[PDB]
A paper describes a structure:
In NMP degradation pathway, [name] catalyzes the conversion of ribose-1,5-bisphosphate (R15P, substrate) into ribulose-1,5-bisphosphate (RuBP, product) in an adenosine 5′-monophosphate (AMP)-dependent manner. AMP acts as an activator of [name] and in its absence the enzymatic activity has been found to decline dramatically. Monomer of [name] protein consists of an N-terminal α-helical domain (residues 1–122) and a C-terminal α-β-α sandwich domain (residues 123–324).
One asymmetric unit (ASU) consists of three identical (root mean square deviation, RMSD: 0.16 Å for 321 Cα atoms of 324 residues) subunits of the protein. The active site pocket of [name] protein resides in the cavity formed between the N- and C-terminal domains and was found to hold the product (RuBP) indicating that the substrate was converted into product during the process of crystallization. This closed conformation is reflected by the bend angle of the α5 helix, which is ~10° for the closed conformation. The amino acid residues of [name] protein involved in interacting with the 1-phosphate, sugar and 5-phosphate group of RuBP are well conserved in all [name] enzymes. However, the strong binding of the substrate/product of [name] enzyme to the active site pocket of [name] protein by forming interactions with all the crucial and conserved amino acid residues clearly indicates that [name] protein would function as [name].
Author numbering:
A (entry chain C), B (entry chain C), C (entry chain A), D (entry chain B), E (entry chain B), F (entry chain A): 3 to 324
The structure:
Amino acid sequence: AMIVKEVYETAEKIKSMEIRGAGRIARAAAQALMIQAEKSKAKEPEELWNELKVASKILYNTRPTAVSLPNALRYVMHRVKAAYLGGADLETLRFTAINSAKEFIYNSEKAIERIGEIGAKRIEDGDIIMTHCHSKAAISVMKKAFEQGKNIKVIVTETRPKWQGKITAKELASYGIPVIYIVDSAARHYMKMTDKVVMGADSITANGAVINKIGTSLIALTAKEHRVWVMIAAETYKFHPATMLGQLVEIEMRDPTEVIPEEELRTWPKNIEVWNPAFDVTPPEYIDVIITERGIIPPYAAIDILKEEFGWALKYKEPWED
Amino acid sequence: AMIVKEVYETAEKIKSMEIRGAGRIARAAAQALMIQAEKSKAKEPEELWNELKVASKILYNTRPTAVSLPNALRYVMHRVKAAYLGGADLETLRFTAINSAKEFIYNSEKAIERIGEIGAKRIEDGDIIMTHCHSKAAISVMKKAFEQGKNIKVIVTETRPKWQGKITAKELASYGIPVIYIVDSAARHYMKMTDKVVMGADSITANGAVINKIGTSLIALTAKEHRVWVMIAAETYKFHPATMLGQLVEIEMRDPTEVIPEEELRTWPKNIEVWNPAFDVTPPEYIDVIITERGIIPPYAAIDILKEEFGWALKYKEPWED
Amino acid sequence: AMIVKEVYETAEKIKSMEIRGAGRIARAAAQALMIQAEKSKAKEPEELWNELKVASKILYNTRPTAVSLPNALRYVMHRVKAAYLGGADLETLRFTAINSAKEFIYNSEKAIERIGEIGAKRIEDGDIIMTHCHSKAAISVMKKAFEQGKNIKVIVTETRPKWQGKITAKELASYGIPVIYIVDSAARHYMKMTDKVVMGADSITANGAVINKIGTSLIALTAKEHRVWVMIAAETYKFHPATMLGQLVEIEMRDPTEVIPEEELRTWPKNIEVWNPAFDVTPPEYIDVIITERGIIPPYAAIDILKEEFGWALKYKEPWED
Amino acid sequence: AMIVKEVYETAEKIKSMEIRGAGRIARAAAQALMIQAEKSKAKEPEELWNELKVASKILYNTRPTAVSLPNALRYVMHRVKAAYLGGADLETLRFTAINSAKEFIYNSEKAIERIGEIGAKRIEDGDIIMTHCHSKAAISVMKKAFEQGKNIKVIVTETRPKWQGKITAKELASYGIPVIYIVDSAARHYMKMTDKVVMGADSITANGAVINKIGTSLIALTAKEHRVWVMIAAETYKFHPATMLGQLVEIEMRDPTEVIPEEELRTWPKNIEVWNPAFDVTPPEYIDVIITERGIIPPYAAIDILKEEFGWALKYKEPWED
Amino acid sequence: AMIVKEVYETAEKIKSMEIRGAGRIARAAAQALMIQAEKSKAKEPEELWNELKVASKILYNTRPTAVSLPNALRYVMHRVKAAYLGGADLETLRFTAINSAKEFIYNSEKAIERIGEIGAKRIEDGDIIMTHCHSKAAISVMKKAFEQGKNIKVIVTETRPKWQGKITAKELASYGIPVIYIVDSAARHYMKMTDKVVMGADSITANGAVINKIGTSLIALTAKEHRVWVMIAAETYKFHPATMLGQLVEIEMRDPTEVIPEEELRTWPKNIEVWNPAFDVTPPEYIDVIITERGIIPPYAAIDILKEEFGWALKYKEPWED
Amino acid sequence: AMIVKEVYETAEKIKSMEIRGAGRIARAAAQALMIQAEKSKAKEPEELWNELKVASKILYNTRPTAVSLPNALRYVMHRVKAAYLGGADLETLRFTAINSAKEFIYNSEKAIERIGEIGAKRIEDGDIIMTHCHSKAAISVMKKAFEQGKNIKVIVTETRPKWQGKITAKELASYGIPVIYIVDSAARHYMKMTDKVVMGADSITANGAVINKIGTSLIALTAKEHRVWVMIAAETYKFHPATMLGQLVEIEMRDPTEVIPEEELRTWPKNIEVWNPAFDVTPPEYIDVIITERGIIPPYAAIDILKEEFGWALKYKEPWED
Ligand SMILES: O=C(COP(=O)(O)O)[C@H](O)[C@H](O)COP(=O)(O)O
Ligand SMILES: O=C(COP(=O)(O)O)[C@H](O)[C@H](O)COP(=O)(O)O
Ligand SMILES: O=C(COP(=O)(O)O)[C@H](O)[C@H](O)COP(=O)(O)O
Ligand SMILES: O=C(COP(=O)(O)O)[C@H](O)[C@H](O)COP(=O)(O)O
Ligand SMILES: O=C(COP(=O)(O)O)[C@H](O)[C@H](O)COP(=O)(O)O
Ligand SMILES: O=C(COP(=O)(O)O)[C@H](O)[C@H](O)COP(=O)(O)O
Ligand SMILES: [Cl-]
Ligand SMILES: [Cl-]
Ligand SMILES: [K+]
Ligand SMILES: [K+]
Ligand SMILES: [K+]
Ligand SMILES: [K+]
Ligand SMILES: [K+]
Ligand SMILES: [K+]
């Protein structure tokens, strides 16, 4: 297949984390499919279809843990598959792909804005909020509550090894929100003064577990310990359909040099191994609510989001497979 | 008073953490008093006594949290005080100081070796041990168990912000112990595969609480969560006499530029504050045993170590005060 | 608008708690809209519509915490509103108000009887049951169990500050049920002998939390500590629609002189503040089941009752608004 | 009245536990109805209908606790009853009974197979799995994970008093799976080395509680203590519809001589009573997932399985009742 | 036999709770013995000895639960008994009684002062403290922290049925301390805002359990739930020696008319029983420290206080017994 | 050495468990050293010393887990050793062996009686008590309570694999105590009706952990879940000195054919391994008190019993070593 440059570059940027965060990765995948479709020099429906399948596979094979990425490719490719198999001609097939992409992208933006509005109602004047990593859905909540006049402060954890917390601290301070920045290890120490914990998600499973940046689960555990509300801000496309049929979520292991720079690491002895898991699993007993664009649910209702939105597709193969 | 150079330099090195770890800080303080005494050009007992009081105050005012430092100065200064007040002449007073210092220093070395031997009996062939920071008492335990032929591995957490875990990983690997190095945030994720947790202490309180490097308490919490043994390796001079009469232990707050380098931090906006607590408090319910040079105790027997060894001195003022 | 006397009187009696209990308040509110529609001297539909709107606002601004009140008002006014906007003449609009209110009242009564039949199946012969406040729904359960010939005893807590427990003790004893009356403080001490706890609700939230009379959450906490089943008897109109989209339930703060009578309180020093929250929040982890007129549910299924009964109205404004 | 000997023999064998296991019991009851219908010498539909009702009652009165049995009888009898009341003639009613019986049996076999395929995806290479009693649904899970090439080992508890664990041990070993066999008392002692607990169910209630062989609740309690996953493998026909309306599940008390043999027991004095409950109740907080043939659910979604499959029947009497 | 009216009046006042609080009751008993000895018209030592024994018995039979009372009687009577049996003459035995009484009283006053000084060091500036009942030992703590210039605020629970919280509220406010006054039921609701719980004790047992005013156990349970420190301020004479040898502490059941006044209660039907326990048992896992006049201890060191102070007396009968 | 027949026989009977129970084993071991000293035909002290050493080694290499055995051996042999090294002639050494052994036996018997008197004070009229295995110390408690006229019932668990519970059930019933006999698996199911749990010990460690018959820790876990008091009746010679200096208690693994009789086990597949741990470890958090002959202690005071009774011997070698 003739795959445009933009697919390869998007995929590279997803792998190296120049494009990061689960929502954004998903939109970048949709965007990459859109562009494959705009620029295809294919002449028959079958050549575009083959290109879109191949592009989808390229994009799916970047980072495994955030289900947002394949849910975006499915959103597009289910619709493209149905049009192709229904006898669509070339320009019809192209436009199904382009318009599906745009639609996912728009709904993603709108879901995040609505999660903001719903989640902000739970934030109260004077609240100290602790967060972790950098999540646009969680930030949407904190930004909105501040826009409503509530005087909040946010405790931002630095989020080793990639320092996502620096992104969050700078962004929240740019909206005028006072920030306290701490190392991850200090989360129990400051949990007494915290009123709420607001974090994002990469995948949410059928039984209510949340997969999110390495350390989330520790934060949640000590939050529960201290009876501090744990709120997870997550779009419907963070819910993981394959877990309904027993699939385990793969935890991505990333390069040890994100932890210890190559310069330093090559001087270390062989009998030291560096392990660098980028995500951990938080069980539902430590989460009080998930804030989606359709409402607040307990984590044990994740299964209902999945049955409503994604169950239908589980009988079929992935829409990009042969 | 005429204070020798070595007192000022020791104190500076303690403050900047070029001399670090609670045991070592204490020995460096004893050592500094020893040298003030060796080199004093005082002519009367009262001039040396005044110099030793002043030196003690200099040393006490470096870092507040590890009670090892004042317990060492007390060990020396109680003995010096009693000799001075008993009418000691100059050379007698000098030697009381020098010999007391040496004695603390020797007993410290021997206590750590014995903690090693006692703690190693609790480590079993095949054990995966998790640790935090860099503690010579904890390391003594792991080194000894490896010397006994037990095939162990150690999970070393990096210990932000000062990276003490790098010291530990390199030291344990130099003895031939296989090391797995992880960020602090990954401690819950790897707690399932961990058999034992072995950490040090800076201060242990009357009710059994352990004050140790920022993050210890999170590690302990998730250890308890997973029914993983939490063992604290601590010399008797880590027990904190003033807590028997209600004293709270001060948590040292260190410079924000240890978290975010000055180059980067000066570019950040004013409405971000960086908080850098160097220690946290682990309650006794999350500790299974303390390994001292006199045995294994439950954390609730800390009070007995204190009553035996230090209660006597609480009626009196600090031995270096006027 | 020409608001009839029974509306003002009902509103004063809800406010002063001469009419109290969440179900009874809701039925009284529907009865008041009923009497307004009956006696209105309106000539136009637009005039009666406007009277019912104003009556509704009066009734809604009485006590904030029990969502039964607005759910009753909505039940009548969604129906009145749809009639009005579909051109109903005067007598059609009138009958729609009167009939919808009678429907609400009749369904409320049947729901309570059915809650009793369902809940009584979980009560066993010889059971000691502890309750709190005065809940018609909880009493329905206990009364039905006793009529089945189960030999029960009920421990009734006094329920400060308003003494609702006196109502409960005399009601149960007048049905022939043996009663043990205790102070709220004694709930842990007698939890060892209790087999079941049965309490009502004022509001149940999307995440499964139960808002009920101050003290409820303490009793639930210690029931859970002791593995004593906590059952909340509640009608579907106790479920709180706005919590689906993030709203917090307002906790009513009633007058200090309910706690300390005015004649005593005026003599107390100024630096004493009396705080009188009329409700607390029991988290779903301390509740075993909610008994609704449609069946036994776990508390985390509250979101399903809400989705199916109330979710449709949330995109619209309140049916009594301009 | 003219009941074939296969109905009586099936009943005897259920009661004596020659036919045992909840799914197998349900298959054997459907089969017994099948045979009554095939061999009936009835000449009129009302007479066949009577035999099916009497045979249903005889099979229902065998063992109380596993709801699979009545759910099987209902599956056949709801269909038979609708055909009888719809005017079906003899051969039509006969066929309805035979074919409904056959479908239940075939659905049961397929459901156990699908549970295996779904549950096996949760099992990872190198897993130690603990199980209890003998459950074909739990075994299907382990058998499929092993066929996928996962090197698992299974800890099998003996399961007093009837020794069902001997069946499990010999069966898993015949498939190639290594087994560690222990007494029920040792389950906490080996919970440290276990990665997963996989058990079956007799009845699952509307609140998510699982009723299973005596001792299950203990294993789940200590598994929870240790953060070991508890997975319950259970077909939809193990869900108990009467619990939706408050019914308590009856715990079967079996003969004391299963505990102590008759010869020994008759020598014991009369102030010893032997108590032999065959099942216990595990609360939903100690269960991570239930694996049904429709997917993985949190136990709190048991109510959703009940609503969509069984709720409809609750307004009617039992299809075998007069 | 010739008992002075002050003994009888002291006893009446203890029984009616005109003299109340464990420490005050013990002081009043020592004082009553003092007065019997001062005013005795006995002419022989055996006759004074008899009066002291009879008066001890009368004071012992007033209120059972607070061990301070018998410990005060023992303090005086062990000394009196050793003087009588050592041959003391009249004036010698008289003086032994007077002076032992005086020492107990003076030691009690000093002990409460020292508890204040020790406990106040645990209180930090800005602390919200919750308390229960009226305890002079707990109040000494708050009063001293305020005198040190810590801006504290105290949540005082009303303490039904005798309203001891009104004493506490008015007393702390008279010292300048702001008070929030609430019903006992609201303790969980305000536990989120509380930094510390500070209560007293009637008896502390050999296993670390604290027996204190009804409701204490509830407050400690929810404090533990919230990670709020529970501190018990208690003199050494609140430790219960008979528990070392297995004795159960008797929980006083007081008149029902303290709960419901006589006038109302006589109108109630006979199938209502009012139960009025005046104390409950808080287990040691819910207590962080006991603050004695000898220092801070974990509750598990209660046995050490008992061993060193009281153990000696357990082989003897009560010093007032024949 | 000329070892008498009774030593070899006693050692075989400990090994085969014809002599079992930790206290009884200890008394049998002392009785065997006694008989060796009685019948020895030694001529020199050095010869008898050497016989007693060898006899001791034989007796110690029988069963490893109950420290009562070596503590008995030490009791006799510390004394024999000190006599020998202080020049005792033949008859003096002999008498020292015989007398020390008789002293151990007499003190063991008195300790058990006294444990009974102390423990029975914690048992109340109407109590349901659950026990496990067969512990003379626990039986002493129950038997004394029943002789005081407390109307108790005892739930006795069968205690697989060796059925020690049959011994317990018949012993208690022969004293007139009502007995309910159940399988170990049923302990959680009947924990709701139990008021107290009373069990023995084999070894108690420095950190407060109790090593007792397999299953003990499970019963303790669920007692704790249900707030049922767990009391361990144990003599001071059940406390384990070497744990003070870090030693782990060896858990005895007994023969697989205790679980599955040889005639059945030889027919089972090779990939089944039967594991038969005779003991487990109950952590101190699940124990309320230890009842020793010196009084009630919390489990965390085990270290005090050890320090005062046994600590002195730890710097020396075992008194039967070369
Ligand atoms: O764990 C991360 C980022 O992972 P990484 O940095 O590894 O992509 C974020 O919390 C989620 O992705 C959700 O973010 P959002 O709410 O922005 O979707
Ligand atoms: O918390 C630290 C180091 O603090 P820092 O790096 O701030 O000195 C170590 O665990 C203890 O000091 C004990 O170490 P040791 O066992 O070596 O005394
Ligand atoms: O909290 C209360 C009463 O509040 P108040 O007395 O302040 O109105 C009752 O438990 C519920 O309202 C339920 O009662 P019911 O089941 O009767 O609706
Ligand atoms: O409790 C038992 C057997 O009871 P019994 O031995 O008393 O029949 C099994 O775990 C379930 O019945 C599940 O079995 P399956 O998964 O085979 O249905
Ligand atoms: O329980 C009470 C009072 O009981 P009552 O009101 O029944 O006497 C107090 O908390 C303690 O007695 C401590 O008091 P203090 O610290 O004053 O000794
Ligand atoms: O664990 C057992 C017996 O082990 P076994 O039967 O394997 O010897 C008993 O509970 C203790 O030994 C205490 O018994 P006692 O209190 O009688 O010493
Ligand atoms: Cl709310
Ligand atoms: Cl051990
Ligand atoms: K907090
Ligand atoms: K582990
Ligand atoms: K109970
Ligand atoms: K495990
Ligand atoms: K708090
Ligand atoms: K119980």
